[model samples]
Target: DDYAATRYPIILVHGLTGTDKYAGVLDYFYGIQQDLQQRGANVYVANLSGFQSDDGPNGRGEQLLAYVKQVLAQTGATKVNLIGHSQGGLTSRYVAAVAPELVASVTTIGTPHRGSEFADFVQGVLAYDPTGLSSTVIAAFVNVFGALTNSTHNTNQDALAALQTLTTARAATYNQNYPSAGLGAPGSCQTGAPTETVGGNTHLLYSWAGTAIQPTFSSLGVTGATDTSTIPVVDPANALDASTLALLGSGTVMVNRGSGENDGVVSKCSALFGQVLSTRYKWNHVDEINQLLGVRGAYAEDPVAVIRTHANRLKLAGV
Candidate 1:
């Protein structure tokens, strides 16, 4: 083919509160980064926070943007593709939508472009309650690790701000400015207007998620959690048992929203919002790449192969 471009770099961003490890002791997303690199595709795993809402979304997006710019500099390519997991999906979408010229394509695993009622329920209810357990947990997590994550990516102060109206409004503005983003609206996550710029840029997207709630490995409580049953594999039912569901409180209404072909945290539909929306199996947030102990198991698809297939399709379409 006589191609001279560096294998299109694919940046993998993690979800909220997800740092290399979203689940307990499992690091499958990292495996994908290494695997993609072996395939001659330049790969980078973004260390944004996972599942929780404290990942400094705006700052992380900009920080990721810096890396994209750097990769462009190194390869002399105008733009690079991005592959994200969970919150990584939104973060990548935000960056590209704001600066679409820098991104060639985006692929996500278990990310919710549409806001999850689970999250809204958690954040909204806990926001001003008498005992704000959920909000406090989210804030405490940020207080504990936000700085380290931010510094690693060279993020700015905006990353530290709480997930408030300010953050929401800012994201809304970003969405408005880039209709070609193909992401859900800031206010309407997973439910928004579509991008219709016509000739703006060829935006490619794809997604995969799981649909189970077995015991995750961490729940095993140190007996090594040998069996996936022993582990806490995103057990929304807290075991598919009746008691755990009880702990979910009134918020149980939104739990099923988390139960999809997702990696436990995101529904399959949300993960693949603008893309394939593949739901072959329900994976947990971390299982998309790791597949270590969950129903989906690890690295189900080769990230590079997926990218190449889509890129070639882009070529044929003449976008």
Candidate 2:
């Protein structure tokens, strides 16, 4: 009977380009909400920015602050437990940093705590131009795509700034301030070992991620061979192929300018923050959030189960 109820309310924060739900009935979190509800847990998923990938962290954090206050006011709870996924994880820390009194605990999944060098790599490859013309063109395209997929209609959206906030430089500055639950910052951005005080207080911090890109291809299937102009598309429908290629490119960059351990989109070293809760799993960026519609590998941890387990953990810890 005591499956999901904790000492505080639970707030779910989504990552970049994410929304609270899809098509009214299809939740972006897929099976997690239902699982938590079934376990008698009170849960609320945040909708800070449906297309936050086109935005920056502090902007999103402000929205999250309002949302958290609203949740507190509505539930009459003094504090809340935050479970932020990907970029959502980083933003959640912003709330905890300035307003620690409002947060009981914070759990991040696949969050780039140290920042991903792939942001720079992708920027250089996809948007770089000597005349600065290409970035605008690429930003326009991404804005259009983001608008079509989500609610990112920011005509003034600074794609460069959005990517800039994801770099390791930004993370270094951020870590200098927040320092993850006041544990200090010796190795605040790594996996396998936890450094934060354990089982002590409600102001706990934890995080985890994955590193497999091939499992998605088995489910997403290959893309169409030709474009609208009949031009042969290299990996049209297969997002996994594109992810792999990006990983290869990003991997090379990581070897020189980044962390070698990544989860296709974010480096493992970057995804880590505060008290790392789990070992690096064999899942990819999308798989961490269960974005493949339940097409993960046989041995892969179920994303819904992962969240549910965390909720139960929070419950047991008196959070």
Candidate 3:
């Protein structure tokens, strides 16, 4: 039961268009928190703005800092380990960089550490309008959509800002401003040190990612020879259905631009940060968080187990 226990509590942070829960049922990280808790790991999920905000007053990072304090106050723990997915990772990095003493470790999954080409492409499309009206119109619509979907109901959402933040150029600037001890250079895919000392406290850093944009149904045991009536219909909500189809479109865009191996939205090189565990998981961006009812590739490692294993790693490292 204590297989995943660590010295400090763990905080699971969500990414763009994310929430702790949806309609108080579905979770952003799916069943990860419950599994970690059952294995004896202290866990909490942070709720922040669904859309990205500039790194200013009450930005996503600042909001996370407040949540960290709240979690510490509730648990009476000096520090907490953070596990973030997608854009959530950037917010976690912001917290560790600004208040290293409050963090024990930072682990990211499927995060665009070096930014994403897909984002750059989207930004280019948005910037094509000289009048800037298209960008504003799209941002307003997305802001409303984020507010509606986000359980936090944070009104500080900015869709254009979020897109810009995930671009490679902006990521370079962000890395410079919030430089971490184990972060690689702007254009490299190197794994950095496993640990670094900051503000008299040493913080552990780790990351891992997936490369598959979508799973092939034929490989998941759906063969033409098999009795079609015996197999259950694919769930409409499954990422493998519509969501993955969207990722397939984006993934093609990234591949055509020479982004190399990518998990639809993020390239493997961009996902590399800290002591990289691996970037070859058969999962996709949604699969990394075990989302859309935990559907994934037939041979993919269990996302929940991967997180639990990382917790054990932190325990062994004495974090």
Candidate 4:
């Protein structure tokens, strides 16, 4: 009872540009699965694709279906709980929508339920001017990297098309097919102000996000931007990247879009799909997946504790 040994197993799914393992070298979810295991939770991390090269959610969901069934057979569990990050959340939702009986619950951390403006911006620019050759070039690189990292096979996935799937416009289209009661309509933004329908019938739904950004040099001079200092032994080299850098300067972009608050990727309002378990954390989008590289602030909560607590919450609910 103290450790949240639930009736069903927990499956961890990754987001875009993510892999299950770096050919056994590195883990995308880091130490999260192990930590959950220590707390008496049966956990399994899934491998979809490094680039999600197929037809976005539906295609990935098909692949996930096989993995989910495998997990069920291996554990003799009827249903499983999905704890997904970023696009993984969307992918999980697709699975739940198609096969509700197989899913017991879903908890998304820092998922862009609405859409990502950064992806929108880049997609438009890359696909601009005539034939869209520029975007194709970039996708080739994505394909190559996926191969290098031993990612799953491509179903003739177009990289440019994948980016289009994450835009607000495309997200609206996606919601039409796989609707969420918690999220309301496509354009209509809905958050549980106080009293709200908690979850889907076949499965429970929960979500949360990290609203703070680890400050960067470009954002130091700006107002409303945070400055996260470096830790020699803790910080991973990927702390500074194009996506993260864009997040460092996300304050202005968020304001421009009128998207209340953000965690360097999805806006707070957009991330609020189901009953929000906790969105007050200072963790960033990547941090939500336990990729902080040990660079947490004084008041920052431990990612391991968060995962364990949620599992306990699920256990108490008999999910």
Candidate 5:
């Protein structure tokens, strides 16, 4: 059980439009926390501003800084290992850049290190709308959803701020401000060195990505749809599939923009940062965190297992 017992505690940060828990029941990272804990890793899940807050001044990065300090004080750890998904990865990078002394490593899963084409497309659409109707409506819905999901850290949710930050231009500017090792230039799918040093402190950086927006029964190798003969009653219809359907539009936008491969929201090239792990997983944005009740692609590696293995990797590295 000590396989994942690392020297420093691990903190899991969620992405945009994410919460630590949904209605105090569903976990954003699904079964990841428990699995790590069971394997002897000290894990903390961060609940930050969901719908808004970029990496700019007074953004989610600042919020996460406070949370990291609190976690350090509570766990008595001088440094922490940060594992983040999507925007959470960018937030983690912000903390590492500003407060490298407090970080041991930063691992990003399916993060848009460069930028997301889908965000650019959405921002363009909003910009073209002269009446400002779509932007206001989206902000209202996002803020309401954020409130409902218990993300009370920032009451003033600015959906446009988040959208702007995720655009290719904003991401490039952000990279200049908070540069790290092993990050490629905008539109380049390059990997960086494994180590980054800032403020006299060095941190290990790693990243991985998923490319598939959806998975089919044929992909899972299931012969027939209905399998009631099994004990638990196997059925192909699941939440992951539903989420895939919902994300299809955005995925198409990304592809249409000439983004070769994407995980519904983030493109594979954009997701590359630090020492590249694997960028070809058969999972979507949500599946990277084992979300929607732990449902993932049939042929994809188990997200929980992947996280656990990473914990062990940190342990082996003595970080």
Candidate 6:
């Protein structure tokens, strides 16, 4: 009924508050795009916001839907694969849970399925996010939408609380009841977006993360920065309370455990949600999507090369 009878174009969705270029680890996806295109498969990146706090999943998901619809209209494809990075992965999953017929597979790099502790530290800046922030400000924003995307918004005014929504009891219920069409979790990390599809279609999810504290070399010494800048900035704000800070301190307990194999942000558990991929160095959130320098990691040495290796696998009907 659609282009799946032959080839299908892959649609790439960006993270919340992210722009099209110079955005969320775009480098990694760029690498994926070129690799797939050279193989004769069509790949397109959605110009969604990947910036911190600038992009929330709800409105952006609506934007993604527009582009998805456009791509489908012209290509006449029944479905496409989803490759989301960080929050984008969850955003894509939100779409899949609501519309499985629109996708075939979903792969994410360092997706925070259970929400990251980093956010907890940041949320405490206020009152309930897991980090800390003005309780009033967060309730005014994050919590209201927390229910919509199965993520946190307002319960508390902390950084972690903001991202903790995904790990909440409500989220667990959502994951179990809704489920994804892919290989993700049945509850939260499992699948609501990729679970068993009663809609008569199938989907798959995968991920990659860097845990090592990679040193970004410039003219000066290595700049210690999280690939997702949001974490470091909000980590030390006075807005964080004692209890919230304690939760963040203990957050390592719930970490995805990349064994120093995360993208300087997300852990391996959140990154490789499904089929385990190579956990090596010379890669981070930026490098994962081809957003790093113009150079691609050596095909043989760079474990990131998996982008090209599995390029076609993400195409609908195997292209």
The count of residue-pair clashes in candidate 2 stands at 3
TM-score of each: 0.62, 0.78, 0.90, 0.84, 0.90, 0.61
- lDDT of the candidates, in the order given: 0.48, 0.65, 0.81, 0.70, 0.80, 0.49
Give the TM-score (vs. native) of candidate 5.
Answer: 0.90
List where candidate 2 sits over 4 angstroms from the true fold.
22-26, 50-58, 151-158, 181-202, 213-258
- Among the numbered candidates, top lDDT falls to 3
The list of candidate 6 runs beyond 4 A from truth reads: 1-6, 23-28, 51-58, 128-178, 181-196, 213-261, 279-282, 294-304, 315-319
Report the lDDT of model 3 for residue 80: 97
| Model 1 spans > 4 angstroms off | 1-7, 20-28, 48-58, 130-138, 147-178, 181-200, 213-263, 291-319
Q: How does model 4 fare in lDDT?
A: 0.70
Instruction: Output the better candidate (1/2) by lDDT.
Output: 2
Per-residue lDDT of model 4, residues 1-319, tens digit only = 3496888999998887677875556677878887788788898988876555223444667778889999999999999999988888888888888777788888888878888877777766775658757666788988666655644433334456567767878777787877766565555666533122224345678888777643233443443445142233244423533334445566446544455556776776678777788777876677676664444444456787888899999999897
lDDT of 5: 0.80
For model 5, the stretches where C-alpha displacement exceeds 4 angstroms are: 151-154, 213-240
- Give the per-residue lDDT of model 6 (tens digit) for 1-319: 1222225667767653344444233333555555566666567777643322212343455657667788888888877777777777766776666667887767776566555545544444444345334555555464333333322221222223234443434334444654544445533333323234547766666665544333333344223222221234343211332322232233333333212234544545455455445555444444455543433223213433566555544544363
The whole-model C-alpha lDDT of candidate 2 against the native structure comes to 0.65
Query: Candidate 4: which stretches are off by over 4 Å?
Result: 53-58, 150-158, 186-188, 192-201, 213-224, 227-246, 250-252, 297-299
Sorting all predicted structures by TM-score, with the top scorer first, yields 3, 5, 4, 2, 1, 6
The pairs that clash in candidate 2 are: 223-237, 223-238, 261-268
Residue-by-residue lDDT tens digits, candidate 1, 154-173: 22322224344113233344
Candidate 2 accuracy as TM-score: 0.78
User: How far off is residue 282 in model 3, in Å?
Assistant: 0.7
Candidate 3 residue lDDT tens string, 109-141? 999888899999988887779998888988999
